Design a protein around this ligand. Structure first.
Ligand code: 626
Ligand code: ARS
Ligand code: ARS
Length: 263
């Protein structure tokens, strides 16, 4: 089906980014509520990522999983590229985290299960190394997690330090120490994410980025007294310096703390 701008009506902005914006939208015929991400070819070419957009939209286009925000279609014109995306009505996990300061164990274990399931699916399709920070996670109508780390910034919502290798807070030891990485980086990210969910802040925070790099290399992090032994065991396992010793996603999904707290 060849979509066109004429097929949609655009509503309020859901986000503003460097490459473009994202709006609430409705498809003329079905009257279905979606999200329309609008990217400007000008900024795309300026960054020499024009061809890379279509290639990335191609792989994402075929990823169908309940915890991965669906990318339905795409069309373009002389100056803009339009991405038709599933609408997640409850917003970002990040905003929920700010509102509550931290998540309880049941909510956290549930999100971890959903992310582990989605990652499992992606890894099987050879899709790896994702930016799974709270700001890139949306929530469905039932509160289910929707991974939306397609990239191509069209929103904020924070000033967390990022690098060409990824979000600094989430960078694994291998990337900081100059070694080549593999899909095991996603397990480390899952450990950092779980920690942030339960604590409200990243485990390697420091007075300077230089010191953060050092603490990641030494896997130097501690927990607040309120985190339980079950959570500590899973996170400690995920945050192992040796990539190969981090648990398999199957082992995460079957971890005692996860099975006991995940809905
Ligand atoms: C109590 N609440 C407060 C705020 N509320 C919403 C605030 C924001 C949203 C929202 O962004 N929804 C989206 N749905 N599909 C998308 C593709 N998006 C991006 O590509 C842009 C991205 C943003 C993050 C990752 S990718 C973004 C969306 C929904 C509700 C309503 C009621
Ligand atoms: As993925
Ligand atoms: As890199």
């Amino acid at each position: 089906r060849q979509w066109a701008l004429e097929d949609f009506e655009i509503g309020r902005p859901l986000g503003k980014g460097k490459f473009g914006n994202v709006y609430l939208a409705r498809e003329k015929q079905s009257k279905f509520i979606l999200a329309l991400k609008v990217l400007f070819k000008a900024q795309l070419e300026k960054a020499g990522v024009e061809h890379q957009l279509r290639r990335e939209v191609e792989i994402q286009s075929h990823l169908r999983h309940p915890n991965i925000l669906r990318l339905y279609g795409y069309f373009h014109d002389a100056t803009r590229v339009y991405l038709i995306l599933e609408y997640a009505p409850l917003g970002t996990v990040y905003r929920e985290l700010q509102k509550l300061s931290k998540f309880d164990e049941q909510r956290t274990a549930t999100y971890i299960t959903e992310l582990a399931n989605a990652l499992s699916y992606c890894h099987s399709k050879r899709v790896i190394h994702r930016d799974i920070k709270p700001e890139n996670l949306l929530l469905g109508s039932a509160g289910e997690l929707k991974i939306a780390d397609f990239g191509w910034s069209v929103h904020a919502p924070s000033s967390r330090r990022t690098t060409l290798c990824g979000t600094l807070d989430y960078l694994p030891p291998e990337m900081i120490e100059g070694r080549m990485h593999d899909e095991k980086v996603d397990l480390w990210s899952l450990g950092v994410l779980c920690y942030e969910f339960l604590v409200g802040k990243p485990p390697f925070e420091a007075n300077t980025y230089q010191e953060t790099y050092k603490r990641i290399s030494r896997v130097e992090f501690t927990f607040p007294d309120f985190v339980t032994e079950g959570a500590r065991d899973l996170i400690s396992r995920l945050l192992k310096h040796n990539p190969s010793q981090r648990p398999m996603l199957r082992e995460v999904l079957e971890h005692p703390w996860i099975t006991a707290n995940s809905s």
